[PDB]
Amino acid sequence: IVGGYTCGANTVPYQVSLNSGYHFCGGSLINSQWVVSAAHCYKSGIQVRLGEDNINVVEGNEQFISASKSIVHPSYNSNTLNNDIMLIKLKSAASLNSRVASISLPTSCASAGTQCLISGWGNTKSSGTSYPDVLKCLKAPILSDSSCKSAYPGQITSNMFCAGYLEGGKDSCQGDSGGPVVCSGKLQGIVSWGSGCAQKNKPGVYTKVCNYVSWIKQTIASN
Ligand SMILES: CCOC(=O)[C@H](CCCNC(=N)N)NC(=O)c1ccccc1
Ligand SMILES: N=C(N)NCCC[C@@H](NC(=O)c1ccccc1)C(=O)O
Ligand SMILES: NC(=[NH2+])NCCC[C@H](N)C(=O)O
Ligand SMILES: [Ca+2]
Ligand SMILES: [Cl-]
Ligand SMILES: [Cl-]
Ligand SMILES: [Cl-]
Numbered sequence: 001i002v003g004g005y006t007c008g009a010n011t012v013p014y015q016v017s018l019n020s021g022y023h024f025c026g027g028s029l030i031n032s033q034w035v036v037s038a039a040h041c042y043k044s045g046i047q048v049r050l051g052e053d054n055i056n057v058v059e060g061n062e063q064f065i066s067a068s069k070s071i072v073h074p075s076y077n078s079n080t081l082n083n084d085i086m087l088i089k090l091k092s093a094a095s096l097n098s099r100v101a102s103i104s105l106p107t108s109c110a111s112a113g114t115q116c117l118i119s120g121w122g123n124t125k126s127s128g129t130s131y132p133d134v135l136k137c138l139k140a141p142i143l144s145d146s147s148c149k150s151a152y153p154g155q156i157t158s159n160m161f162c163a164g165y166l167e168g169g170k171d172s173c174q175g176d177s178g179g180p181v182v183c184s185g186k187l188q189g190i191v192s193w194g195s196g197c198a199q200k201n202k203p204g205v206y207t208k209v210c211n212y213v214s215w216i217k218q219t220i221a222s223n
Pocket of ligand 4: 053057058
């Protein structure tokens, strides 16, 4: 996250970390057993870390649970990043508390102009590399499908939306992928892609979760 702020410890209770010996992606807890992340975050033997603030220090609110299933969208395209969504089933159910909770799925697509909260342990620098210990937070509005397509001609599918600032200065970045975009109390986005971070006319591009609600519910029911 570039141009964000320190969330505060366990102030994003749905924010998880996907660890393969190290943090490489975010994810969103949507119920006791299931996480939504980005398809491009797929890898074998994922450990899910919940109740994290400082991802490099044990603070005592963590739950560490192995992924038993990692299910990439059937039409995920690694080149276009179309359908950049994955479901992870937890080997056991997370314990509900003030610090570890699910975020609700959308019932509708949110409107351009709606404010969203974007969170993660990704790069905080648009030039060079700095990884924060503690979770960073950004407030960023959904941008018009029109200004998104203007920024990324020939690249924005109906499964993608832009959020942020056409002037740049605030964005998601490398290591935020799979993390939540939460608008009007609902999970509307997954951190997917962008050209650089926080650059002018180059806002973050997010998986449009409202298109996947029926696939998510069917996957959960079957598995
Ligand atoms: C695991 C690393 O992936 C990520 O977190 C990022 C997220 C990008 C956010 N960028 C914004 N401008 N908001 N994804 C990639 O890397 C990417 C690749 C190639 C091209 C673009 C992104
Ligand atoms: N399908 C199940 N077997 N579930 C058991 C729930 C146990 C546990 N978890 C939550 O209720 C929870 C829900 C959302 C987010 C985090 C936890 C509890 O009893 O604490
Ligand atoms: N527009 C915002 N995102 N405001 C929140 C920034 C952080 C908050 N003002 C604080 O003192 O910790
Ligand atoms: Ca920790
Ligand atoms: Cl709708
Ligand atoms: Cl629009
Ligand atoms: Cl176009």
